[PDB]
mmCIF file of C-alpha atoms in Angstrom:
data_model
loop_
_atom_site.group_PDB
_atom_site.id
_atom_site.type_symbol
_atom_site.label_atom_id
_atom_site.label_comp_id
_atom_site.label_asym_id
_atom_site.label_seq_id
_atom_site.Cartn_x
_atom_site.Cartn_y
_atom_site.Cartn_z
ATOM 1 C CA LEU D 1293 17.045 -10.752 -6.183
ATOM 2 C CA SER D 1294 20.672 -11.675 -5.500
ATOM 3 C CA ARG D 1295 21.168 -11.072 -1.803
ATOM 4 C CA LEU D 1296 17.802 -10.359 -0.192
ATOM 5 C CA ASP D 1297 14.994 -12.353 1.346
ATOM 6 C CA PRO D 1298 11.892 -12.750 -0.881
ATOM 7 C CA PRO D 1299 9.484 -12.655 2.098
ATOM 8 C CA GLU D 1300 10.764 -9.120 2.714
ATOM 9 C CA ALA D 1301 12.587 -7.924 -0.425
ATOM 10 C CA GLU D 1302 9.319 -6.679 -1.943
ATOM 11 C CA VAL D 1303 9.316 -3.871 0.641
ATOM 12 C CA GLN D 1304 12.447 -2.545 -1.034
ATOM 13 C CA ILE D 1305 10.679 -3.195 -4.328
ATOM 14 C CA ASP D 1306 7.589 -1.441 -2.956
ATOM 15 C CA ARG D 1307 9.074 2.026 -2.977
ATOM 16 C CA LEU D 1308 11.102 1.034 -6.055
ATOM 17 C CA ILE D 1309 7.903 0.539 -8.041
ATOM 18 C CA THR D 1310 6.504 3.885 -6.904
ATOM 19 C CA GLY D 1311 9.388 6.233 -7.642
ATOM 20 C CA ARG D 1312 9.895 4.699 -11.038
ATOM 21 C CA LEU D 1313 6.172 5.073 -11.704
ATOM 22 C CA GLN D 1314 6.307 8.525 -10.099
ATOM 23 C CA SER D 1315 8.992 9.384 -12.620
ATOM 24 C CA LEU D 1316 6.801 7.981 -15.385
ATOM 25 C CA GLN D 1317 3.926 10.340 -14.570
ATOM 26 C CA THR D 1318 6.332 13.223 -15.085
ATOM 27 C CA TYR D 1319 7.049 11.951 -18.572
ATOM 28 C CA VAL D 1320 3.312 11.634 -19.202
ATOM 29 C CA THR D 1321 2.539 15.260 -18.474
ATOM 30 C CA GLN D 1322 5.691 16.708 -20.070
ATOM 31 C CA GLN D 1323 4.706 15.018 -23.318
ATOM 32 C CA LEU D 1324 1.003 15.866 -23.098
ATOM 33 C CA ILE D 1325 1.337 19.589 -22.433
ATOM 34 C CA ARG D 1326 3.621 20.218 -25.389
ATOM 35 C CA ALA D 1327 1.532 17.813 -27.472
ATOM 36 C CA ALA D 1328 -1.426 20.128 -27.097
ATOM 37 C CA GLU D 1329 1.008 22.995 -27.583
ATOM 38 C CA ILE D 1330 2.253 21.484 -30.835
ATOM 39 C CA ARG D 1331 -1.220 20.755 -32.214
ATOM 40 C CA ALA D 1332 -2.569 24.192 -31.338
ATOM 41 C CA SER D 1333 0.482 25.525 -33.094
ATOM 42 C CA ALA D 1334 0.024 22.993 -35.880
ATOM 43 C CA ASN D 1335 -3.634 23.794 -36.451
ATOM 44 C CA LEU D 1336 -2.437 27.347 -36.924
ATOM 45 C CA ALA D 1337 0.176 25.979 -39.316
ATOM 46 C CA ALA D 1338 -2.402 24.242 -41.459
ATOM 47 C CA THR D 1339 -4.422 27.427 -41.217
ATOM 48 C CA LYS D 1340 -1.358 29.226 -42.539
ATOM 49 C CA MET D 1341 -1.336 26.575 -45.242
ATOM 50 C CA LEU N 47 -11.879 -0.957 9.484
ATOM 51 C CA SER N 48 -13.674 -4.118 10.633
ATOM 52 C CA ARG N 49 -10.508 -6.146 11.330
ATOM 53 C CA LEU N 50 -7.784 -3.929 12.830
ATOM 54 C CA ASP N 51 -6.967 -1.496 15.609
ATOM 55 C CA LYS N 52 -5.652 2.005 15.076
ATOM 56 C CA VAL N 53 -1.897 1.843 14.635
ATOM 57 C CA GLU N 54 -1.912 -0.615 11.700
ATOM 58 C CA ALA N 55 -5.269 0.214 10.164
ATOM 59 C CA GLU N 56 -3.895 3.723 9.723
ATOM 60 C CA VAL N 57 -0.945 2.254 7.825
ATOM 61 C CA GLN N 58 -3.014 0.135 5.447
ATOM 62 C CA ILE N 59 -5.431 2.997 4.865
ATOM 63 C CA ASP N 60 -2.513 5.343 4.189
ATOM 64 C CA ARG N 61 -1.314 2.930 1.523
ATOM 65 C CA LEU N 62 -4.755 3.227 -0.045
ATOM 66 C CA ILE N 63 -4.781 7.023 0.246
ATOM 67 C CA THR N 64 -1.506 7.468 -1.568
ATOM 68 C CA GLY N 65 -2.810 5.991 -4.791
ATOM 69 C CA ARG N 66 -6.503 6.743 -4.713
ATOM 70 C CA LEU N 67 -5.468 10.360 -4.407
ATOM 71 C CA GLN N 68 -2.935 9.790 -7.164
ATOM 72 C CA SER N 69 -5.681 8.386 -9.387
ATOM 73 C CA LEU N 70 -7.849 11.415 -8.727
ATOM 74 C CA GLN N 71 -5.022 13.803 -9.500
ATOM 75 C CA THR N 72 -4.276 11.979 -12.745
ATOM 76 C CA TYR N 73 -7.934 12.284 -13.725
ATOM 77 C CA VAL N 74 -7.914 15.995 -12.935
ATOM 78 C CA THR N 75 -4.819 16.610 -15.038
ATOM 79 C CA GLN N 76 -6.225 14.672 -17.997
ATOM 80 C CA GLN N 77 -9.520 16.542 -17.831
ATOM 81 C CA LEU N 78 -7.739 19.883 -17.641
ATOM 82 C CA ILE N 79 -5.714 19.252 -20.776
ATOM 83 C CA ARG N 80 -8.755 17.868 -22.564
ATOM 84 C CA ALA N 81 -10.690 20.978 -21.547
ATOM 85 C CA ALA N 82 -8.014 23.247 -22.970
ATOM 86 C CA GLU N 83 -8.261 21.384 -26.266
ATOM 87 C CA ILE N 84 -12.035 21.771 -26.150
ATOM 88 C CA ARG N 85 -11.584 25.476 -25.484
ATOM 89 C CA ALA N 86 -9.471 25.835 -28.596
ATOM 90 C CA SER N 87 -12.194 24.074 -30.547
ATOM 91 C CA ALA N 88 -14.857 26.306 -29.020
ATOM 92 C CA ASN N 89 -13.034 29.521 -29.828
ATOM 93 C CA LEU N 90 -12.625 28.234 -33.367
ATOM 94 C CA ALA N 91 -16.333 27.466 -33.532
ATOM 95 C CA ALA N 92 -17.230 30.909 -32.230
ATOM 96 C CA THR N 93 -14.922 32.402 -34.826
ATOM 97 C CA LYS N 94 -16.676 30.403 -37.535
ATOM 98 C CA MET N 95 -20.094 31.389 -36.230
ATOM 99 C CA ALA R 796 -6.473 -32.046 25.317
ATOM 100 C CA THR R 797 -4.327 -34.739 26.869
ATOM 101 C CA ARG R 798 -1.747 -35.286 24.138
ATOM 102 C CA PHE R 799 -0.936 -33.156 21.122
ATOM 103 C CA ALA R 800 0.853 -33.827 17.862
ATOM 104 C CA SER R 801 4.475 -33.187 16.961
ATOM 105 C CA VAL R 802 5.967 -30.368 14.946
ATOM 106 C CA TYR R 803 7.044 -33.210 12.639
ATOM 107 C CA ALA R 804 3.525 -34.588 12.205
ATOM 108 C CA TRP R 805 0.954 -32.020 13.312
ATOM 109 C CA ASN R 806 -2.817 -32.136 13.818
ATOM 110 C CA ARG R 807 -5.510 -30.495 11.718
ATOM 111 C CA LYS R 808 -8.936 -30.201 13.318
ATOM 112 C CA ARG R 809 -11.293 -28.758 10.715
ATOM 113 C CA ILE R 810 -13.958 -26.671 12.435
ATOM 114 C CA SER R 811 -17.149 -25.457 10.804
ATOM 115 C CA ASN R 812 -20.830 -24.773 11.642
ATOM 116 C CA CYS R 813 -20.643 -23.632 15.266
ATOM 117 C CA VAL R 814 -20.886 -20.384 17.214
ATOM 118 C CA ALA R 815 -17.448 -19.158 18.238
ATOM 119 C CA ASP R 816 -16.431 -17.427 21.447
ATOM 120 C CA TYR R 817 -13.013 -15.834 21.094
ATOM 121 C CA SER R 818 -13.383 -13.384 23.971
ATOM 122 C CA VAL R 819 -13.227 -16.108 26.616
ATOM 123 C CA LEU R 820 -9.958 -17.150 24.995
ATOM 124 C CA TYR R 821 -8.915 -13.494 25.044
ATOM 125 C CA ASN R 822 -9.654 -12.299 28.585
ATOM 126 C CA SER R 823 -8.410 -15.460 30.307
ATOM 127 C CA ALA R 824 -4.868 -14.822 31.538
ATOM 128 C CA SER R 825 -3.289 -18.181 30.752
ATOM 129 C CA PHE R 826 -1.229 -17.223 27.710
ATOM 130 C CA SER R 827 2.354 -16.164 27.077
ATOM 131 C CA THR R 828 1.607 -14.498 23.743
ATOM 132 C CA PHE R 829 -1.354 -13.621 21.523
ATOM 133 C CA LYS R 830 -0.449 -12.311 18.072
ATOM 134 C CA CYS R 831 -3.235 -11.913 15.522
ATOM 135 C CA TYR R 832 -1.853 -11.082 12.102
ATOM 136 C CA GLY R 833 -4.080 -9.420 9.531
ATOM 137 C CA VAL R 834 -6.957 -9.029 12.017
ATOM 138 C CA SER R 835 -7.023 -6.722 15.032
ATOM 139 C CA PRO R 836 -6.758 -8.917 18.165
ATOM 140 C CA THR R 837 -9.853 -7.632 19.940
ATOM 141 C CA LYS R 838 -12.011 -7.352 16.817
ATOM 142 C CA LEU R 839 -12.242 -11.179 16.668
ATOM 143 C CA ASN R 840 -15.882 -11.094 17.707
ATOM 144 C CA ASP R 841 -17.461 -9.075 14.932
ATOM 145 C CA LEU R 842 -16.283 -10.828 11.775
ATOM 146 C CA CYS R 843 -18.109 -13.980 10.714
ATOM 147 C CA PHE R 844 -16.143 -16.729 9.096
ATOM 148 C CA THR R 845 -16.222 -19.531 6.544
ATOM 149 C CA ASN R 846 -13.756 -22.132 7.773
ATOM 150 C CA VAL R 847 -11.661 -22.677 10.891
ATOM 151 C CA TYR R 848 -8.560 -24.868 11.048
ATOM 152 C CA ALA R 849 -7.308 -25.646 14.545
ATOM 153 C CA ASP R 850 -3.640 -26.564 14.177
ATOM 154 C CA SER R 851 -1.800 -27.714 17.306
ATOM 155 C CA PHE R 852 1.772 -28.863 17.935
ATOM 156 C CA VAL R 853 4.717 -28.189 20.274
ATOM 157 C CA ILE R 854 8.029 -26.447 19.695
ATOM 158 C CA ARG R 855 11.287 -25.266 21.204
ATOM 159 C CA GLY R 856 10.530 -22.071 23.080
ATOM 160 C CA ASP R 857 12.890 -19.763 21.208
ATOM 161 C CA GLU R 858 11.345 -20.933 17.922
ATOM 162 C CA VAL R 859 8.271 -18.821 18.603
ATOM 163 C CA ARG R 860 10.471 -16.142 17.061
ATOM 164 C CA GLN R 861 10.453 -18.337 13.951
ATOM 165 C CA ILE R 862 6.754 -19.233 14.010
ATOM 166 C CA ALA R 863 5.908 -15.881 12.400
ATOM 167 C CA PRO R 864 4.909 -15.885 8.713
ATOM 168 C CA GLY R 865 7.675 -14.798 6.380
ATOM 169 C CA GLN R 866 10.266 -15.318 9.120
ATOM 170 C CA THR R 867 12.875 -17.890 8.169
ATOM 171 C CA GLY R 868 14.206 -20.588 10.454
ATOM 172 C CA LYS R 869 14.784 -24.311 10.775
ATOM 173 C CA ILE R 870 11.147 -24.871 11.643
ATOM 174 C CA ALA R 871 10.079 -22.513 8.868
ATOM 175 C CA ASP R 872 11.985 -23.964 5.907
ATOM 176 C CA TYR R 873 11.881 -27.617 7.031
ATOM 177 C CA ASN R 874 8.972 -28.310 9.363
ATOM 178 C CA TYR R 875 6.052 -25.873 9.432
ATOM 179 C CA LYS R 876 5.374 -23.058 6.995
ATOM 180 C CA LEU R 877 2.968 -20.102 6.812
ATOM 181 C CA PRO R 878 2.377 -18.035 3.662
ATOM 182 C CA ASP R 879 3.336 -14.384 3.489
ATOM 183 C CA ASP R 880 -0.321 -13.363 3.090
ATOM 184 C CA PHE R 881 -1.356 -15.410 6.127
ATOM 185 C CA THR R 882 -4.119 -14.047 8.274
ATOM 186 C CA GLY R 883 -5.211 -15.355 11.625
ATOM 187 C CA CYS R 884 -3.798 -15.798 15.083
ATOM 188 C CA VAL R 885 -0.991 -17.871 16.525
ATOM 189 C CA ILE R 886 -1.130 -18.390 20.278
ATOM 190 C CA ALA R 887 1.708 -19.833 22.319
ATOM 191 C CA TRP R 888 1.903 -20.383 26.048
ATOM 192 C CA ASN R 889 4.270 -22.141 28.384
ATOM 193 C CA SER R 890 4.199 -25.856 29.109
ATOM 194 C CA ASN R 891 6.051 -26.974 32.208
ATOM 195 C CA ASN R 892 3.557 -29.559 33.418
ATOM 196 C CA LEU R 893 1.432 -29.494 30.248
ATOM 197 C CA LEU F 15 15.921 16.682 13.293
ATOM 198 C CA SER F 16 16.152 17.718 16.954
ATOM 199 C CA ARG F 17 14.417 14.841 18.756
ATOM 200 C CA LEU F 18 15.234 11.662 16.820
ATOM 201 C CA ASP F 19 18.285 9.798 15.569
ATOM 202 C CA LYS F 20 19.334 9.020 12.012
ATOM 203 C CA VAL F 21 17.361 5.834 11.408
ATOM 204 C CA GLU F 22 13.843 6.490 12.675
ATOM 205 C CA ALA F 23 13.672 10.082 11.421
ATOM 206 C CA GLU F 24 14.719 8.965 7.945
ATOM 207 C CA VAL F 25 11.340 7.242 7.656
ATOM 208 C CA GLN F 26 9.678 10.424 8.911
ATOM 209 C CA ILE F 27 11.600 12.596 6.470
ATOM 210 C CA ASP F 28 10.721 10.037 3.772
ATOM 211 C CA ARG F 29 7.058 10.819 4.376
ATOM 212 C CA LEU F 30 7.884 14.535 4.349
ATOM 213 C CA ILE F 31 9.391 14.516 0.877
ATOM 214 C CA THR F 32 6.589 12.693 -0.917
ATOM 215 C CA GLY F 33 3.810 15.233 -0.633
ATOM 216 C CA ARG F 34 5.937 18.324 -0.488
ATOM 217 C CA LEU F 35 7.540 17.277 -3.758
ATOM 218 C CA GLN F 36 4.129 16.137 -4.945
ATOM 219 C CA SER F 37 2.566 19.502 -4.134
ATOM 220 C CA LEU F 38 5.436 21.143 -5.978
ATOM 221 C CA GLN F 39 4.685 18.952 -8.978
ATOM 222 C CA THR F 40 1.019 19.757 -8.449
ATOM 223 C CA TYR F 41 2.015 23.411 -8.474
ATOM 224 C CA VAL F 42 3.971 23.001 -11.717
ATOM 225 C CA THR F 43 1.088 21.242 -13.446
ATOM 226 C CA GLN F 44 -1.330 24.004 -12.470
ATOM 227 C CA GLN F 45 1.166 26.566 -13.749
ATOM 228 C CA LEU F 46 1.829 24.819 -17.062
ATOM 229 C CA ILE F 47 -1.789 24.345 -18.136
ATOM 230 C CA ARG F 48 -2.657 27.905 -17.199
ATOM 231 C CA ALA F 49 0.419 29.090 -19.099
ATOM 232 C CA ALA F 50 -0.883 27.408 -22.238
ATOM 233 C CA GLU F 51 -4.128 29.316 -21.760
ATOM 234 C CA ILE F 52 -2.050 32.465 -21.436
ATOM 235 C CA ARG F 53 -0.115 31.271 -24.480
ATOM 236 C CA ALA F 54 -3.445 30.799 -26.229
ATOM 237 C CA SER F 55 -4.463 34.225 -24.997
ATOM 238 C CA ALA F 56 -1.391 35.969 -26.360
ATOM 239 C CA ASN F 57 -1.505 34.910 -30.001
ATOM 240 C CA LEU F 58 -5.124 36.018 -30.157
ATOM 241 C CA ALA F 59 -4.002 39.384 -28.830
ATOM 242 C CA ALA F 60 -1.136 39.971 -31.244
ATOM 243 C CA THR F 61 -3.307 38.958 -34.172
ATOM 244 C CA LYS F 62 -5.707 41.666 -33.055
ATOM 245 C CA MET F 63 -2.688 43.933 -32.812
#
């Protein structure tokens, strides 16, 4: 926003939105897979309780 | 499709593809994890039965 | 038309409720440029439209580089401005007796 | 690499990375979920052991 032209700077933003969101999807799955892996371990843990 | 020739229609479509495909792949991943959870529940239910 | 309007004060002819014919404007070889943004330039026949605004003026000839939407320039920031999401066609042709 | 210069091929390589990298991430996600099924398989086995 400092030194670019707002009729075109969004094109640089355009890939900038994606790769940051692309990185966010990695954090989604990396949480979710272990989250099932914790609970399936945890349901065993309460079963051991 | 009703308002452009090939070389630019392909671009706009390609923008749609990368993102509709992404949505589909997200859905697939979510359903897979949810199915694994359901499997754990089903094996538990079979064990109880 | 005989006389047009300026780039300072331009002319807006609102056009509705008539049958268009863009192809006769397309195939006639009396034009320097024909740049249809957002719509394919030969697909002008098949899409049916709500409102038509005929906007005519005159300009320095190198400032057809600056007539494009989003493109900056002394006509663009001071005189005549298009949005970034503009669709439609701008047509410019030479005027040496016109 | 052999028929274009630095600028125009950088766009073409840009398209090459997204999709190869995405398939790799698609490959990882298929591996991880199946691994959890194998992980769910194993604890059932050793309990039967």
